[PDB]
């Protein structure tokens, strides 16, 4: 589980003292989070699931 969305730090103060931190700017190309998993390993785990 990765997230190649590279974000900076933007702080805007709401009234006295209080600080709100939100997503700054994304550096690079636009892309999905990208979790990733194996194909065969899972298949192998599913093998005994369908059998049970």
């Amino acid at each position, epitope marked *: 589980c990765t997230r190649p969305n590279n974000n900076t730090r933007k702080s805007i103060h709401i009234g006295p003292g209080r600080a709100f931190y939100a997503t700054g700017d994304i550096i690079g*190309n636009i892309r999905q989070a990208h979790c990733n998993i194996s194909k065969a390993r899972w298949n192998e785990t599913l093998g005994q699931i369908v059998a049970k």
Partner: antibody
């Protein structure tokens, strides 16, 4: 980088065409795609195919019952089969590489076209019996 | 298939303008390329944002400017734009430019 075209440039009305093109040199010969171009005698241009090693069947649908694109695994030589329609527009046929340049290896994520960057010599295919 | 401009003359070392209209445009960018008389076509576009000559990504015509170059540039121009389902690229009735002098 280099492209050498082969095959007989003569076809009898209708019949079949066994057009060929060999890729001579490349640093990255798999990730990049492949396209065929139909140049009019002296008018315009027409798009053919688009073939990739993964078994991609992206092609010209205007002449869908005429398209048969060949991709050889060993060596980067490509072949094209023209069935039934050959005599309608006859002139020149060029072969060009369609660059991909993926930022991320995700096939659905960051794929784009740079266009037909590398073109070949181009052989003359004239149909008149 | 495509609404390609037939023929436009050159300005005397000034502003250059072309169109090429169609339905995709905002879908699969532009891509130009030029056919040299009796020679193999060559590169024009330098697409990377997901040389020399540039264009504006519009939904009307897109257009393209080749700077203030009068001579050294005269060939048959085209446009290759992919459909939403990667169907075809579509091309018009060619673009045969002419140089003055």
């Amino acid at each position: 980088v280099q492209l050498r075209e082969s095959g007989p440039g003569l076809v009898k009305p209708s019949e079949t065409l066994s057009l060929s093109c060999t890729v001579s040199q490349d640093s990255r010969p798999s990730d990049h795609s492949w396209t065929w171009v139909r140049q009019s005698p002296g008018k315009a241009l027409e798009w053919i195919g688009d073939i990739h090693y993964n078994g991609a069947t992206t092609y010209n649908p205007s002449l869908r019952s005429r398209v048969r694109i060949e991709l050889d695994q060993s060596i980067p030589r490509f072949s094209l089969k023209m069935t039934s329609m050959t005599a309608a527009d006859t002139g020149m046929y060029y072969c060009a590489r369609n660059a991909i340049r993926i930022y991320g290896v995700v096939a659905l994520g960051e794929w784009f076209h740079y266009g037909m960057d590398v073109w070949g010599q181009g052989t003359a295919v004239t149909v008149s019996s | 298939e495509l609404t390609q401009p037939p023929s436009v003359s050159v300005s005397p070392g000034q502003t250059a303008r072309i169109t090429c209209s169609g339905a995709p445009l905002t879908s699969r960018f532009t891509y130009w390329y030029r056919q040299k008389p009796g020679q193999a076509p060559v590169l024009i576009i330098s697409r990377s944002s997901q040389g020399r000559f540039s264009a504006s990504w519009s939904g009307t015509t897109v257009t393209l400017t080749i700077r203030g170059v009068q001579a050294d540039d005269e060939a048959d121009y085209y446009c290759q734009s992919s459909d939403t389902s990667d169907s075809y690229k579509m091309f018009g009735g060619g673009t045969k430019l002419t140089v003055l002098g």
